[PDB]
Symmetry: D2
Subunit: 176 residues, 4 copies
Amino acid sequence: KNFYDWIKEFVRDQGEFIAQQSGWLELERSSYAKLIAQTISHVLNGGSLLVSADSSRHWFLNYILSNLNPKDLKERPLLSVIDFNASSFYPKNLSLATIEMTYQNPMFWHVGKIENEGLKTILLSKIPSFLWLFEELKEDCLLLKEHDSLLDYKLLQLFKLFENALFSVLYNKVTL
Amino acid sequence: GVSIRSMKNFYDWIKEFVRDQGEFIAQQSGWLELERSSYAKLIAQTISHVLNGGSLLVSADSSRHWFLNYILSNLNPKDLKERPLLSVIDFNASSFYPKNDANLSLATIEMTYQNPMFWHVGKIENEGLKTILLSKIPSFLWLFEELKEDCLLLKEHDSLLDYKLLQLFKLFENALFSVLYNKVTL
Amino acid sequence: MKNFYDWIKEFIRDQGEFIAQQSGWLELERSSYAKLIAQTISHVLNGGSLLVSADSSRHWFLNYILSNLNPKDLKERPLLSVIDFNASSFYPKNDANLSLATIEMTYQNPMFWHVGKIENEGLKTILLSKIPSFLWLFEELKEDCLLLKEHDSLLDYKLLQLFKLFENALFSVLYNKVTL
Amino acid sequence: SMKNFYDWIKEFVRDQGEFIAQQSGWLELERSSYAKLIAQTISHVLNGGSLLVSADSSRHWFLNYILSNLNPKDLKERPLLSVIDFNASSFYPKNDANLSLATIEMTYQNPMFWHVGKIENEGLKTILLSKIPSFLWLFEELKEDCLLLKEHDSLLDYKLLQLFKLFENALFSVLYNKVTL
Ligand SMILES: [Ca+2]
Ligand SMILES: [Ca+2]
Ligand SMILES: [Ca+2]
Ligand SMILES: [Ca+2]
Ligand SMILES: [Ca+2]
């Protein structure tokens, strides 16, 4: 096929599939609303978010941190968000005791695969969590499809939902 | 009277917000189909550069560091499987990233790399970078202002910008491998 | 224009001679490094966290602190509560009151360990705060600090030497060899 | 029996500086072979070559040091030297065929590998053994022309600084026509 013919077809099809799957969140049955609410409550209570992601999702870890605390905060609060992947306490279990000792009120927010047992053990602990996983670990998580070709878009969409929900409660547009 | 806004219950609000969010995505989903050409040729030029042995020096504005990360990790994934190892460089992190004296950066870049092309995404946040992106060096510029005629023009305050970045990347990588794997001819 | 090989022999001889000459500098150091080290060790023993920062030229030394305090293989060592403050979202670019409040709410018991120049006012304000600190500075800010000379050609070695003193002191008390 | 901290630290400090003094002439005693290696590295830079710098896990700080010292935040009148963090490169070898070497050779006009410390995977080992020019600071003599560091030397960290300071002075002494090579 000629490049220019091919690309026209590819682009048309790409947009049509986005459109087709664009209502997926209306059908999503994992408890994302309740999890978002619980995470917002944690933030309001002065809690910290310790954010981690699988190897393929480091870009999305970066996205969370930069969006939650943008370079120019303007009127925004400085939110208690920590890059857990980059932490000396990331488990490769001394990690849990050190975490509990150093942070007043942490909650783990993890996205994607759980790539080692140390992390699994930490996430299975009693400390609160906001888990976006490819399979349920224990307790309601936000469930994603690992080989979904639209996964990357869905991650952005869920983040944008979370940030809107969070600031809607701040700024008193919405009550939990 | 008109009435001061009351306030909505979270669980009522979120259902409406979710519905509207997806529907706005659907409304806008055909945007690229409506774009009046030009971008295909720019993608083709970038692919030819890779085909010819060229390197991609990738930079992004402060808000798009995540997208710089995404480009690098998608083009050269952890498990290459059967893929080539593509010549892709994080230019943001480079010692040659200009402060200013873009002339010094440019000269060092030109002697260091056999065949560089600058792929920049977003705002150009200093004069040194602007000078280089204006240079004779081949470029793949995704900008908010049309600083060259041949650039991909992004809409800066578009609430859907982040998705469009993913979409353009996914178009690019598919176009690149379609040609690398002899599925299509340019 | 000396020949390279002649030049390098002289340079090497002189380099080692100057190291030797200045090698007893710490015996003559009059800033309160012993007291500051003790107070930092007590903080660590009390479950305190160390939030470590450094000026632009000393990012390598920030890295050195983090990797030495918590090496890849801990073996029998504790996991120490050490944080890269330069890299954190709370590092004050502007403004310091927001960062301080967020730090105080986030960490149970932080202590700031800063090395080198204080390159913005937000950091200065934080280091001026009530929060405990271990300050290795080119001029005294506040309370007793460990004083360094900015343009000392041997500065980089002295930084290593002070770290090595700190880590030996710390583990000496942890492994009950020494009592505070 | 336990020692008092303030007594202990005074002794420790004294002995620390004196050991540094005792060992301070180490480089003067070395067979001068390192001089030729430094010269070769300088000639590479003079000739328009790039330095692709890597380090073992324990020496990441020293990789940082090399990069920030060779190209400081304020260059003043200095040239912008062709120096690359190879650890951070997408071409850093893992598995993974020898895709890395071919991509490196096509990407860079004239690379030299400057590696410091342990060689922590076979892929890196393979490249550092390649025909590509190198400046290797190693714990075992994996080629005859390398700088040999003493691995469990308690003064290793100082010697790394000292060797770097030697290198940068040698490099600019030649760049600035203070010495002939
Ligand atoms: Ca619908
Ligand atoms: Ca145009
Ligand atoms: Ca072809
Ligand atoms: Ca030899
Ligand atoms: Ca000359």
